[PDB]
Amino acid sequence: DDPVVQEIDVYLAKSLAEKLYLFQYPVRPASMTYDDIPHLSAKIKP
Amino acid sequence: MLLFCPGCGNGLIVEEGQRCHRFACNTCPYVHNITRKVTNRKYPKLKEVDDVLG
Amino acid sequence: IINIKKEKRETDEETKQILRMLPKDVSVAELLRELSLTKEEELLFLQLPDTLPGQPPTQDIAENACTLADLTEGQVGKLLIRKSGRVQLLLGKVTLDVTMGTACSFLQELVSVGLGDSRTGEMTVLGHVKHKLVCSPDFESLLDHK
Amino acid sequence: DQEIVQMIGTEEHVMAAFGPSLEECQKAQIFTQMQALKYIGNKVRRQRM
Numbered sequence A: 001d002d003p004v005v006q007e008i009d010v011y012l013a014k015s016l017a018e019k020l021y022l023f024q025y026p027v028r029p030a031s032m033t034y035d036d037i038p039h040l041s042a043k044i045k046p
Numbered sequence B: 001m002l003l004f005c006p007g008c009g010n011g012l013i014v015e016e017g018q019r020c021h022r023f024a025c026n027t028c029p030y031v032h033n034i035t036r037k038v039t040n041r042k043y044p045k046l047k048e049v050d051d052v053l054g
Numbered sequence C: 001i002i003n004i005k006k007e008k009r010e011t012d013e014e015t016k017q018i019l020r021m022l023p024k025d026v027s028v029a030e031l032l033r034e035l036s037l038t039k040e041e042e043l044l045f046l047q048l049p050d051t052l053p054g055q056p057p058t059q060d061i062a063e064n065a066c067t068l069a070d071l072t073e074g075q076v077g078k079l080l081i082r083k084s085g086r087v088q089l090l091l092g093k094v095t096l097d098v099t100m101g102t103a104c105s106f107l108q109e110l111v112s113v114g115l116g117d118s119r120t121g122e123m124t125v126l127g128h129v130k131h132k133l134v135c136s137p138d139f140e141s142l143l144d145h146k
Numbered sequence D: 001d002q003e004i005v006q007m008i009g010t011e012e013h014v015m016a017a018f019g020p021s022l023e024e025c026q027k028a029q030i031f032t033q034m035q036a037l038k039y040i041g042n043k044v045r046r047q048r049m
């Protein structure tokens, strides 16, 4: 079993190393998104 | 069946509005009027044995 | 009634309780359809091992953890797709294996929270996360190697 | 409640079995963490003063 196909390269980027967050909503199915809902504010603590 | 509020995720109950039967949430103003037939069958187990023995 | 605010059936893959009228995929087929069947870009979420097979480059040390925070930009490894569906990640001298993570069905949004100013910052919704990858060391090869 | 049901399980008979507990919870007005904590504290017994 040789590596027949898809010898994909892997790059690394540190431009957004400290600014990248992952938000997951446990109660919202992936089909329905918050794209159309107008947001008003976001409070955060660094 | 069990249905949950898209807003907060609490359980939805069935009540009556001023025009139609609607699903409603007990903790937020979310509602949903019923348009067409909605059904939830269960198909309970039937007594299949003839019970002849001996 | 509004078609995009219907009540949700509990099974997140089958929320279509009312209508107007999934087989478990594998990484090789995943990437194969991601590139051959379609050319659209995709956002993936892969979990790397705790320590990468490297050394902190002049990071002031100790055999400590070598994470992505220490490595530099550029090509860091190759992704190999062998026959019979084996999916490896050659990250230098060693090769890890990449498998499917838990099939998430809830919404996962990859966003960028950039505090450009100490008083005002930007949230940038980069995209949606659909599939999760898990990378693990091929312990059998590391053991039979030495 | 949806998160609780997700944690319990997504099989149909699981929801059928767990429905009465949700109904009993909804009969009371317990909907926040504070309300449930207050209920439990009411259901608490002091260890001999």
Ligand SMILES: [Zn+2]
Residues within 6 Å of the ligand: B005, B006, B007, B008, B009, B010, B025, B026, B027, B028, B030
């Ligand atoms: Zn609600």
